[PDB]
Design a protein around this ligand. Sequence first.
Ligand SMILES: *C(=O)[C@H](CCCC)NC(=O)[C@H](CC(C)C)NC(=O)OCc1ccc(Br)cc1
Length: 214
Amino acid sequence: PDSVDYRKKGYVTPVKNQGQCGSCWAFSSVGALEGQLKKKTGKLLNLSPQNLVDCVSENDGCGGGYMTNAFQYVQKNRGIDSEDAYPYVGQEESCMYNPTGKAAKCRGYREIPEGNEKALKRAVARVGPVSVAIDASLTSFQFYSKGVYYDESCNSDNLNHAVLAVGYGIQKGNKHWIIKNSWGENWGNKGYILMARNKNNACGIANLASFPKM
Ligand SMILES: *C(=O)[C@H](CCCC)NC(=O)[C@H](CC(C)C)NC(=O)OCc1ccc(Br)cc1
């Protein structure tokens, strides 16, 4: 497909805010799951980022983590709670079990061929929102406000932030990836940022992408 924007089909929930917690990966993971859930059931709702922060032991909660492990967890645990049944508190707590909390399930996940933007594009068009990792350490990124973001000093080999690709397209001749962050709706462009697509895998956008099976 030439251009995709899952927000137009109602596959994306509102922009969240990590608070005082480095739980970007939990947010990235739920966003993908929320997508497969909308596609599968027709229901659009917030999943529990906290459920993952607290239970994905392979990870390190507020200290950071990886999306794959989160997907592996939801599959092994036979489910993930919703935001309502397992609200976000912004810090790591003991893993809670909500008898009525299950709101989605995961039967695995797939990875995108490392550094392949073309494969990332095909995956977004056919699957839905995809979880991707990038280098967000540049002041240029942290202070992004508008336009298609590109900074040559971005480090493809310095993955330190997890986000969500809800689509892709082109703006003013510049191809981009539609990216949902989790620093609240006041960061970037209403919690969003258009990142350079096909610019030598800028910021390593396609170096660690994955989506959940549902
Ligand atoms: C995003 O908010 C966080 C910021 C963590 C620094 C405060 N970044 C991550 O969680 C990254 C996710 C991308 C690299 C995909 N993961 C990460 O930092 O891994 C660190 C880590 C430490 C210990 C364990 Br156990 C697992 C992972």
